[PDB]
């Protein structure tokens, strides 16, 4: 049935720069049929935010830096000078048909300068071996851009296969990133095995960093 | 004070039936129209529903034909979601929304969501664990220190440190499914290396889905 | 653009009758566009009221002998035991546009037993001769069918294009109707001759009804 | 206690300027959105504009853009079509109307209509003559009287009956157009014979478009 068609699908942009989404009707429409487009911002762990209604009127409290244009079957959302508060997933959304449909989605990324993680290791508690279990954790703060690697070493054995990671969403104030990378291990592993590093590789680290603890030590 | 709030949203095994409830405060829902929309995890919006209670007239995506019915209770002004036969496509979060004033077609007000988790395992609470501080580990000229909260489930968790006492350099990451199926995370915050072993971090870690609260006082090892 | 289509654009039925009404829209449609169809009733001097919304809703205050049902792109206004007092033209009107249109609407008239006319003649005032016109009129009251013949005479010469008439709605109560006749003469036309006349043939007379005055009688 | 009612109509000259008002009661115009709709003499109902007061927010038919202008006044819980440039085609009862409740789509309140005639012609008052039957004239009992009114521009007239108290028997006859270019309409009723030249029967007839009043008292000669 009738949808529409979201692009670009993501983008990465500076501060003050324009940037243009664009939301097209997947066919034709008979003329003289309203779709009464809206647009949406989305943040992490928020609802969305109405931003533009029936097109191109601006919603109340919204900056006006948002605009939204439409011709035919093809419809714009427009932020004229992008702020670090923009970093948000964009929608759109046609009412041609009952239900009305969502685009897909936009996520804008703000592009900043540089910045390399300030970066820390865990050891595991003593609370937690008591289960049979060891947690290492490694913390990359407040870096850009957010392509980061992160390799383990147990007694300079890599460590392959036993770790997750998670990544923050964009810092709305200062467009960084943070990232962990957990090492899971048996007690019995665990106490078998000195020292534990973690080596972080970034585009802002000139060489790799490595962080470092000798498990009984302090 | 234009509110709304669902509630009523968490975990229930495939083919069960859950109520949803969506309380709106600052406007009465007989004036208006009442929408669902819901969202799986690291997906787009789904429209789900929507209700002029007035007249009692419904419309549903074709997704729920059949299986959810969407009402509203005027004296009570509540919209409910009843969803029956549940399936694990249907997780996500949930969202109610209006529409204002006589201005159709956008939804300008919406609620905070709540979670709808389709699944035969059943709910745990974390284990909560320190991320010590150190004097000895300092980087970009501070001290970092945090929780780990381990094997929970379903999503989710809330960490606030110094009970919101403390909210600048924290970063309580997504969770990540472990190979168990349970949920971890942590929750990290930086600090000045003077501030060790004199000032006191407390994270305090809510998973209501188990009823689980703990307070977790994390301080260098000695 | 898309219209809708109504049928038939008149029809007669008699107290107690199902009476249906169709509105078809020009084309197709995309499937999920709502088109939100309204019925209106109006009668004589008087704005449309909604009988009828979004498709099958009965709007409040209005008799239950009204629904209306739509499938795909026909829809259907019913009144399920018609009354005297349904005597109105009905419209379709269509949202799937904007501007939305109407159907170009349905004459509905109430059919019932025949009824001979009432038949009165009315001379010119010596007022309005003093300003060089004389008119004649001829009534015709309560009556059914609508159909009628009034024929003009004076002192025996059969008046052609010189007269026009007048017809009343259908009554809302009694389903007739009445009918005048104007018959125009100059003043001096009028004062040379004797005997007006005016004869009329209705079905529900045997024969023809003849009212007539002599001039200067009074 | 809903309401709305329009004003503004009457006799323009072609290309001439008119501004209607559709003033509302019961309600807010604010919380809604007003239509204007119009019905040519004759003929179907034709949708003109729209607004949404709160934001401004118009829509028009293809007929009369760049021509009319619909807006309002919140203050005044009045709306208005301003139109210009008026063509004969316009000619038309114009109507305004409402949506209710969140009720899109649906008008549930409509004014009584306004009549908009486009025209070169000018007002003309009708001159009003009795109708009644000649002194030698027989009846079985009932007899008729009434009212010409002759020789008026624009539509409308209204006649009443003895001040509104003789509203029984009566008919008052769709007005026809007249070679010269003017109305004239009669209005009849039907009394009992016995009461002509006992009872007083007065016609009533308003010509608002010239500011003509009648009240003529009609008896046989």
């Known amino acids: 049935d009738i949808q529409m068609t979201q692009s670009p699908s993501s983008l990465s942009a500076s501060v003050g720069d324009r940037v243009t989404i664009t939301c097209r009707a997947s066919?034709?429409?008979?003329?003289?049929?309203?779709?009464?487009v809206a647009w949406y911002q989305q943040k992490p762990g928020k609802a969305p935010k109405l931003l533009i209604y029936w097109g191109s009127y601006l919603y109340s409290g919204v900056p006006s830096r948002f605009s939204g244009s439409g011709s035919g079957t093809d419809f714009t959302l427009t932020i004229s000078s992008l702020q670090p508060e923009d970093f948000a997933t964009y929608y759109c959304q046609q009412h041609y048909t009952t239900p009305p449909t969502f685009g897909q989605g936009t996520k804008v990324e703000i592009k900043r300068t540089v910045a390399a993680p300030s970066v820390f290791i865990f050891p595991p508690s003593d609370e937690q071996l008591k289960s049979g279990t060891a947690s290492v954790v490694c913390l990359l703060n407040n870096f850009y851009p957010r392509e980061a690697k992160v390799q383990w070493k147990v007694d300079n054995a890599l460590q392959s296969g036993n770790s997750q990671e998670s990544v923050t969403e964009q810092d709305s104030k200062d467009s960084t990133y943070s990232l962990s990378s957990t090492l899971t291990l048996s007690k019995a592993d665990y106490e078998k095995h000195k020292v534990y590093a973690c080596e972080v590789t970034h585009q802002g680290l000139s060489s790799p960093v490595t962080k470092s603890f000798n498990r009984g030590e302090c | 004070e234009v509110q709304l709030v669902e509630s009523g949203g968490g975990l229930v095994q495939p083919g069960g039936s859950l109520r949803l409830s969506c309380a709106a405060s600052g406007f009465n829902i007989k004036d208006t129209w009442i929408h669902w929309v819901r969202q799986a995890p690291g997906k787009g919006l789904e429209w789900v529903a929507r209700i002029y209670p007035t007249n009692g007239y419904t419309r549903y995506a074709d997704s729920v034909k059949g299986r959810f019915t969407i009402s509203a209770d005027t004296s009570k002004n509540t919209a409910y979601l009843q969803m029956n036969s549940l399936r694990a496509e249907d997780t996500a979060v949930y969202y109610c929304?209006?529409?204002?004033?006589?201005?159709?077609?956008?939804?300008?007000?919406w609620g905070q969501g709540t979670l709808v988790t389709v699944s035969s395992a059943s709910t745990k609470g974390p284990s909560v664990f320190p991320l010590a501080p150190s004097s000895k580990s300092t980087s970009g000229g501070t001290a970092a220190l945090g929780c780990l909260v381990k094997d929970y489930f379903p999503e989710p968790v809330t960490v606030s440190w110094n009970s919101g006492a403390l909210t600048s350099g924290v970063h309580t990451f997504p969770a990540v499914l472990q190979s168990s199926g349970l949920y971890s995370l942590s929750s990290v915050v930086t600090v000045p290396s003077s501030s060790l072993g004199t000032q006191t971090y407390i994270c305090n870690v809510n998973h209501k889905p188990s009823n689980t609260k703990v307070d977790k006082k994390v301080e260098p090892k000695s | 653009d898309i219209q809708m289509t109504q049928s038939p654009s008149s029809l007669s039925a008699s107290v107690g009758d199902r009476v249906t009404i169709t509105c078809?829209?020009?084309?197709?449609?995309?499937?999920?566009?709502?088109?939100?169809?309204?019925?209106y009733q109006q009668k004589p001097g008087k704005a449309p009221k909604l009988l009828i919304y979004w498709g099958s809703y009965l709007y409040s205050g209005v008799p239950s002998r009204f629904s209306g049902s739509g499938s795909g792109t026909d829809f259907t206004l019913t009144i399920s035991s018609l009354q005297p007092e349904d005597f109105a033209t009905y419209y379709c009107q269509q949202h799937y546009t904007t501007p939305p249109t109407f159907g170009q609407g349905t004459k509905v008239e109430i059919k019932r037993t025949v009824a001979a006319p009432s038949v009165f003649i009315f001379p010119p005032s010596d007022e309005q001769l003093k300003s060089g016109t004389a008119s004649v009129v001829c009534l015709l009251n309560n009556f059914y069918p609508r159909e009628a013949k009034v024929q003009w005479k004076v002192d025996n010469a059969l008046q052609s294009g010189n007269s026009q008439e007048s017809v009343t709605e259908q009554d809302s109560k009694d389903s007739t109707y009445s009918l005048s006749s104007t018959l125009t003469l100059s003043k001096a036309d009028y004062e040379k001759h004797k005997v007006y006349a005016c004869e009329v043939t209705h079905q529900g007379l045997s024969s023809p009804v003849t009212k007539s005055f002599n001039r200067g009688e009074c | 206690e809903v309401q709305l009612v329009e004003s503004g109509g009457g006799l323009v000259q072609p290309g001439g300027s008119l501004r209607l008002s559709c003033a509302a009661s019961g309600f807010n115009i604010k919380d809604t959105w007003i239509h204007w709709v119009r019905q040519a003499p004759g003929k179907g109902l034709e949708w003109v504009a729209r607004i949404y007061p709160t934001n401004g927010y118009t829509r028009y038919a293809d007929s009369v853009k760049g021509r009319f202008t619909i807006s309002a006044d919140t203050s005044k819980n009045t709306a208005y079509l301003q139109m210009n440039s008026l063509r004969a085609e316009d000619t038309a009862v114009?109507?305004?109307?409402?949506?209710?409740?969140?009720?899109?789509?649906?008008?549930?309140?409509?004014?009584?209509g306004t009549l908009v005639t486009v025209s070169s012609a000018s007002t003309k008052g009708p001159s009003v003559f009795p109708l009644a039957p000649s002194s030698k004239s027989t009846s079985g009992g009932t007899a008729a009287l009434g009212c010409l009114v002759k020789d008026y521009f624009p539509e409308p007239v209204t006649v009443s009956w003895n001040s509104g108290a003789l509203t029984s028997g009566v008919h008052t006859f769709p007005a026809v157009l007249q070679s010269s270019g003017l109305y004239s309409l009669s209005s009849v009723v039907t009394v009992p014979s016995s009461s002509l030249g006992t009872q007083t029967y007065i016609c009533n007839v308003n010509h608002k478009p010239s500011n003509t009043k009648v009240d003529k008292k009609v008896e046989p000669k």
């Open positions: 929304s209006r529409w204002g004033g006589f201005m159709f077609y956008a939804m300008d007000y």
């Open positions: 066919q034709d429409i008979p003329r003289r049929i309203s779709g009464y």
